[PDB]
Design a protein around this nucleic acid. Structure first.
Ligand SMILES: [Mg+2]
Ligand SMILES: [Mg+2]
Ligand SMILES: [Mg+2]
Ligand SMILES: [Mg+2]
Ligand SMILES: [Mg+2]
Ligand SMILES: [Mg+2]
Ligand SMILES: [Mg+2]
Ligand SMILES: [Mg+2]
Ligand SMILES: [Mg+2]
Ligand SMILES: [Mg+2]
Ligand SMILES: [Mg+2]
Ligand SMILES: [Mg+2]
Ligand SMILES: [Mg+2]
Ligand SMILES: [Mg+2]
Ligand SMILES: [Mg+2]
Ligand SMILES: [Mg+2]
Ligand SMILES: [Mg+2]
Ligand SMILES: [Mg+2]
Ligand SMILES: [Mg+2]
Ligand SMILES: [Zn+2]
Lengths: 36, 351, 140
RNA sequence: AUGUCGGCUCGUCGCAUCCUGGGGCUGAAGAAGGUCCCAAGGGUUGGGCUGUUCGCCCAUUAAAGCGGCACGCGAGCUGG
RNA sequence: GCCCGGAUAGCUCAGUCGGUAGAGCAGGGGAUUGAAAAUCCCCGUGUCCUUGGUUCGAUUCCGAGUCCGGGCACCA
């Protein structure tokens, strides 16, 4: 969810960068990552 | 043993329960929660293996004179084709029968018999010593490393205590039914007029298990507060958190310490105590467990025996099962493999 | 490997067959007869032999089926070919038993009607490999 | 000569949030929870024991938060 | 934590300038006894705690270490 190292966990997960913040979106919500 | 093994296994019972397995098995009733599936086939194999049992029986029954032709014809092959399926058979005959008995928790461990002389004072102290030589020789010739723990040679005769290790496999599972009271009737070699008196004894048996001693406590396992100590000290005692307090959350046991002026050395002494008092609750439960492994019986007085031994009427009546041999002398020297199986059969019966 | 409609392949032994463990629910779950199969099966097993016939059965609403029989797994013909009970646990190094460049060819003949490679060297190959598949080196 | 613990009185600031307001996950059915995020506006009880801070306990509560202020506050008090 | 004193047979303990090793007890084999005790002959086993060093050699003389025994840890 929220952390320092936001990486990938699928073959299905984009490294979206919105609002200076590096988020991470995947099909399954368990992979919804943000950085903080 | 060999001819009888069958019956007492659910010989006719199991072969009816067997299809009860597959019974509810088929028809996948919304196979949700996983449960019988596990003990589904494993319990099944048991079944049709009573045939492998009647095949190694038939192959070993059709073997009674399965050499009447080998008593008339020695060289051939039409007589050496079922044999490589007959040597292996006399093997499973024993297997599927003693692998149905020893079928319980931890038996393959090295055992630890203990002999304490019941009533009869000195007689019992001797009868005890005899019961010692017994299992010893037995386990000895039985291919078992026997290590002598204790031997307290009592007052006038015999012993008062004895404890020995039984190094081997299923040693416990074997010398397990022995655990219990053993009576002895014969004229007292000690009594004056060689009169006839009865002797009693206690023989406990347990598996070797614990070898190490670890008692480390994770930080989260506890809690540590710190406050201003109570006592002498002027400005000091007043403005310092020298007083510690370790609390072990699980047990709830807590320890406090203001021994020295150092919050630090006080945590130290603190835990030092905490540990000490934790092993005490660790050994208090470390034995209320292993002691409930002795049994729930044996008052070691009269009428508690589970197999008596007589010598002026040569026999040995096992009260537990009912069995009664006529060779006390042989039993007391090794002969046990007979009553050990039976002893189990009786027991394992209820599990 | 033809058409598909709730099919369910599975291997079976000699005449022995019906125990729920191997089969039983194996086809009874997809609604079918353990009856019209327990015997219907031993109608062709008793005829060809008594080993292990890979029979894949298809199913329809009429609890119907089309149990197509094939040659025993190339893993069987290779075993007895050297007298081995089990496989070998960890292959690639321990050759519990072994087979010859010919003994392999024999079997190849026995399964060539199932494969898709007429040639007898082509077939024998995907067999000689079946050795490295269970620790049974090829003699050659 | 910069009066030292706790209590009382008076507070105020922080957020690393105990309630209450929002929100993402969940091994979230629902009601309940768990974990992380946002968010101090306002709230955060009465007692038994001990000089106690700290704790334990009784009876509750939405919750009975953790700190900084010369471990705030003795030219404001107490003085166990 | 500091500073003293320890560890030697199965238990409790001596011992030497550096070569050696002991006592009482328990324990084993015998003897009286009807049978035990007591008593009476015969007995033996030890790295002298660990690990370094000095010496030609260390139980022994020094460094260190572990466990146990004492004594102190005070002014605020
Ligand atoms: Mg006694
Ligand atoms: Mg004792
Ligand atoms: Mg003072
Ligand atoms: Mg201070
Ligand atoms: Mg002034
Ligand atoms: Mg926040
Ligand atoms: Mg809910
Ligand atoms: Mg009050
Ligand atoms: Mg009071
Ligand atoms: Mg405050
Ligand atoms: Mg103050
Ligand atoms: Mg005063
Ligand atoms: Mg006063
Ligand atoms: Mg000593
Ligand atoms: Mg000498
Ligand atoms: Mg002496
Ligand atoms: Mg003697
Ligand atoms: Mg004697
Ligand atoms: Mg000696
Ligand atoms: Zn992903």
């Amino acid at each position: 969810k929220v952390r320092a190292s936001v990486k990938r966990i699928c073959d299905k997960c984009k490294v979206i960068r919105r609002h200076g913040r590096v988020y991470v979106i995947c099909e399954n919500p368990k992979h919804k990552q943000r950085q903080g | 043993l060999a001819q009888r093994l069958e019956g007492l296994r659910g010989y006719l019972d199991i072969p009816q329960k067997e299809t009860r397995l597959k019974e509810l098995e088929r028809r996948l009733e919304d196979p949700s929660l996983w449960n019988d599936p596990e003990a589904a086939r494993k319990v099944s194999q048991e079944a049709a293996r009573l045939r492998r049992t009647v095949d190694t029986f038939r192959s070993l029954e059709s073997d009674l004179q399965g050499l009447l032709e080998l008593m008339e014809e020695l060289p051939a092959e039409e007589r050496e084709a079922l044999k490589p399926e007959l040597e292996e058979a006399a093997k499973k005959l024993d297997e599927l029968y003693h692998q149905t008995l020893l079928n319980f928790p931890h038996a393959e461990k090295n055992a630890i018999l203990t002999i304490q002389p019941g009533a009869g004072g000195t007689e019992a102290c001797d009868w005890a010593e005899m019961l010692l030589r017994m299992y010893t020789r037995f386990a000895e010739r039985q291919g078992f490393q026997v290590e002598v723990v204790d031997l307290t040679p009592g007052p006038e005769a015999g012993i008062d205590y004895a404890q020995i290790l039984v190094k081997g496999e299923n040693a416990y599972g074997l010398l397990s039914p022995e655990a219990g009271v053993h009576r002895l009737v014969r004229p007292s070699p000690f009594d004056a007029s060689g009169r006839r008196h009865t002797s009693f004894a206690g023989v406990e048996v347990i598996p070797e298990v614990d070898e190490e001693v670890e008692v480390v406590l994770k930080p989260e396992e506890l809690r540590i507060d710190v406050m201003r100590a109570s006592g002498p000290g002027g400005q000091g005692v007043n403005t310092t958190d020298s007083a510690v307090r370790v609390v072990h959350l699980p047990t709830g046991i807590t320890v406090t310490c203001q021994t020295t002026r150092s919050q630090i050395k006080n945590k130290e002494l603190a835990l030092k105590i905490l540990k000490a008092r934790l092993y005490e609750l660790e050994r208090k439960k470390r034995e209320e467990e292993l002691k409930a492994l002795r049994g729930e019986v044996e008052p070691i007085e009269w009428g508690s025996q589970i197999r008596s031994y007589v010598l002026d009427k040569n026999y040995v009546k096992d009260h537990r099962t009912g069995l009664m041999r006529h060779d006390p002398e042989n039993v007391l020297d090794g002969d046990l493999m007979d009553l050990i199986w039976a002893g189990l059969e009786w027991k394992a019966g209820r599990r | 490997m033809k058409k598909v409609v709730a099919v369910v392949k599975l291997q079976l032994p000699a005449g022995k067959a019906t125990p729920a463990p191997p089969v039983g629910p194996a086809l009874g779950q997809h609604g079918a007869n353990i009856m019209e199969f327990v015997k219907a099966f031993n109608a062709a097993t008793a005829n060809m032999g008594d080993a292990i016939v890979p029979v894949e059965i298809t199913i329809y609403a009429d609890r119907s089926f089309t149990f197509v029989t094939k040659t025993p797994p190339a893993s069987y013909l290779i075993r007895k070919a050297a007298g081995l009970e089990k496989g070998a646990h960890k292959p690639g190094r321990e050759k519990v038993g072994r087979i010859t460049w010919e003994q392999v060819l024999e079997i190849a003949k026995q399964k060539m009607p199932d494969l898709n490679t007429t040639d007898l060297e082509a077939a024998a190959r995907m067999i000689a490999g079946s050795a490295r598949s269970m620790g049974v080196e090829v003699v050659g």
